[PDB]
Structure 1
Amino acid sequence: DAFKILEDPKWEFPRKNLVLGKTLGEGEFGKVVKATAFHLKGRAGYTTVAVKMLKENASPSELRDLLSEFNVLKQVNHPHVIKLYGACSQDGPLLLIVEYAKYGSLRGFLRESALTMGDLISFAWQISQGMQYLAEMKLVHRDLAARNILVAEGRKMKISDFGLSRDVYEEDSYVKRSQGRIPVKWMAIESLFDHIYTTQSDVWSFGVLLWEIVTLGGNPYPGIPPERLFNLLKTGHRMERPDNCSEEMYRLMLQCWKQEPDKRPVFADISKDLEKMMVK
């Protein structure tokens, strides 16, 4: 119980066909290494992939997050969402075989910088299309931030880290909830006092994501203690306008940071707004 993983034959991949390589990163998310998979999703040769696994000092909750990420990735499929290829759940450790984003996370990619404002609007546009798809799939991401986005080949955005995702309507009789695992500076105001996470709350997190992009990986609300952030946001105060940001771009951030969730735009409208900035 809770430790035995069900073997889904649709996603199970042989362990001998997987060649693990150098570590791409490790932390409070698991262990991710570069790898190669022969005869994957059909056949014909090898494929460069990435493999996520548990750390040597993993806790049972980190296994819950890895299984939750495994479960959500089975259902989603979008060009701007990270793609699950397979898994190794039997006769050894649990390995998730997904895509490979060589430019790494978005926050790391932005801080490494030759990017014009045209690419930044494109990056926000691609993420807005992925969230559009995830909203239509009745999924709440909750942990929408720059360090959770992956920059893949072609500098294309891939939404990742579904370990804390939830359905719009809870389809289980008894779900035991993790509490306070979302970074405060990205939580919507209704999530701060009422523990409410909806699609409109992901729009709030998308506004903070816009700020991270236009500042090329900036730290939102610099120096402000997270304890005073709630009393500050409750009085209608928001972030000031960054440097590299047009008047139309900063207006989109404030709409995502409206007090009433009903007053915030939807991702279908945000995609049409960001596309117009590419045209003009």
Structure 2
Amino acid sequence: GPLSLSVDAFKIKWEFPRKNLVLGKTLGEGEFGKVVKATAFHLKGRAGYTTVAVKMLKENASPSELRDLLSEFNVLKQVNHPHVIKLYGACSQDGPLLLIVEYAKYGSLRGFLRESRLTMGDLISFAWQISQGMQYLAEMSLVHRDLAARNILVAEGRKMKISDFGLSRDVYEEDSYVKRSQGRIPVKWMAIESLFDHIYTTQSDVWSFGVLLWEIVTLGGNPYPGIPPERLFNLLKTGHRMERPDNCSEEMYRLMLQCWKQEPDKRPVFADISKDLEKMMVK
């Protein structure tokens, strides 16, 4: 089927010797993958050991999780930008599939924020770096689909790295990705039209960006707090949106609202978003 084809094609510059990789503690688990801290000997021109992160399948992986890991690999090969996690390689030939990437010292953005108390200007800087990465992926004709504080990494120097490319889809031909069956993206980050109509575009990424803004501004808050996901259908189509959080300027809130406009064409594009944020920074 489509997977056996991919697996067979795959098994036929990115390959890294398994014997040169040493895995250590588990850094995190989750939807399709398990991530461990690791070290790699003689990695792509670097002398000695480099500290890296490695994603692999969890116990009892499904075809869906295998497909997602292969897809993330496929996407990460094609992208290169200061605000996107950097791929080093993979181990495929011996043992389970292992993807080797840049280690982000501070872990997830959500974790980093929740450990915090950081200025409003640090917050705007974070959002803006993410918007630049997103402007780059949108130019590559990729829809990311799973943008969220938990899927952004914070590297040395508090650099934002957009991560978790397992659900990212190429939209070169149509400028949208449409999925017949139900999505595996949390409902509380999905655009109204993704939720109801299974349509994903750069503008649905912009909606998710608005929820990410809310997460940044609340320092890792939980969106629509105390509201069950199943209530989102009706809440959204009756035109409700999250209220301005505490510690949020009105210009920041105004931007969140614009990202959550019902009509996708009415939301800003990532380039507008970046301009808006740089402007808040300098004022």
Range into which the TM-score falls when normalised by the shorter chain: over 0.9
Moved more, 138-147 or 17-26: 17-26
State the shift of 1:41 in Å. 1.4
State the shift of 1:171 in Å. 8.8
Runs of at least 4 residues off by over 3 Å: 1-5, 169-178
Counterparts of 1:234 and 1:31, CA distance in 2: 36
Moved more, 104-113 or 40-49: 40-49
1:113-142 alpha-carbon deviations (Å, 9 max, x no partner): 151111110100110000000000000001
Moved more, 200-209 or 177-186: 177-186
State the shift of 1:82 in Å. 0.3
Inter-CA distance 116–86: structure 2 relative to 1 (3 Å threshold): same
Counterparts of 1:27 and 1:255, CA distance in 2: 31
State the shift of 1:178 in Å. 5.4
Inter-CA distance 66–160: structure 2 relative to 1 (3 Å threshold): same
Secondary structure of the equivalent of 2:29?
strand
Counterparts of 2:80 and 2:280, CA distance in 1: 27
Inter-CA distance 142–175: structure 2 relative to 1 (3 Å threshold): closer
Q: 1:116 aligns with which of 114, 119, 137?
A: 119
State the shift of 1:45 in Å. 2.2
1:240-268 alpha-carbon deviations (Å, 9 max, x no partner): 00001101111100110111111111001
Is residue 2:12 matched to residue 1:42? no
Inter-CA distance 241–66: structure 2 relative to 1 (3 Å threshold): same
State the shift of 1:29 in Å. 3.2
Are the equivalent residues in 2 in contact too, given 1:168–1:199 (CA < 8 A)?
A: no
Q: Would you say how many aligned residue pairs link Structure 1 and Structure 2?
A: 276
Counterparts of 2:172 and 2:82, CA distance in 1: 25
Counterparts of 2:174 and 2:264, CA distance in 1: 23
Are the equivalent residues in 2 in contact too, given 1:145–1:205 (CA < 8 A)?
A: yes
Counterparts of 2:108 and 2:179, CA distance in 1: 30
Inter-CA distance 236–177: structure 2 relative to 1 (3 Å threshold): closer
Secondary structure of the equivalent of 1:109?
helix
Are the equivalent residues in 1 in contact too, given 2:108–2:153 (CA < 8 A)?
A: yes
Inter-CA distance 267–59: structure 2 relative to 1 (3 Å threshold): same
Inter-CA distance 143–173: structure 2 relative to 1 (3 Å threshold): closer
State the shift of 1:272 in Å. 1.0
Inter-CA distance 105–21: structure 2 relative to 1 (3 Å threshold): same
Identity of aligned residues (%): 99
Instruction: List runs of 5+ in structure 1 lacking aligned partners.
Output: none
Are the equivalent residues in 1 in contact too, given 2:170–2:177 (CA < 8 A)?
A: no
Inter-CA distance 100–63: structure 2 relative to 1 (3 Å threshold): same
State the shift of 1:20 in Å. 1.2
Are the equivalent residues in 2 in contact too, given 1:49–1:98 (CA < 8 A)?
A: yes
Secondary structure of the equivalent of 2:105?
coil
In structure 2, the residue matched to 1:183 is 186
State the shift of 1:212 in Å. 0.4
Counterparts of 2:123 and 2:214, CA distance in 1: 11
Inter-CA distance 223–19: structure 2 relative to 1 (3 Å threshold): same
In structure 2, the residue matched to 1:155 is 158
Are the equivalent residues in 1 in contact too, given 2:23–2:39 (CA < 8 A)?
A: yes
1:167-207 alpha-carbon deviations (Å, 9 max, x no partner): 12359999986522111111101112111000000000000
Inter-CA distance 238–175: structure 2 relative to 1 (3 Å threshold): closer
Secondary structure of the equivalent of 2:10?
coil
State the shift of 1:230 in Å. 1.4
Are the equivalent residues in 1 in contact too, given 2:141–2:170 (CA < 8 A)?
A: yes
Counterparts of 1:67 and 1:103, CA distance in 2: 26
Are the equivalent residues in 1 in contact too, given 2:179–2:199 (CA < 8 A)?
A: no
Inter-CA distance 208–174: structure 2 relative to 1 (3 Å threshold): closer
Aligned Cα RMSD in Å?
2.2
1:4-37 alpha-carbon deviations (Å, 9 max, x no partner): 57xxxx2001111111111111232311111111
Moved more, 114-123 or 140-149: 114-123
Inter-CA distance 213–19: structure 2 relative to 1 (3 Å threshold): same
TM-score w.r.t. structure 2 length?
A: 0.92
State the shift of 1:2 in Å. 8.4
Inter-CA distance 174–4: structure 2 relative to 1 (3 Å threshold): farther
Inter-CA distance 215–176: structure 2 relative to 1 (3 Å threshold): closer
Counterparts of 2:147 and 2:44, CA distance in 1: 29
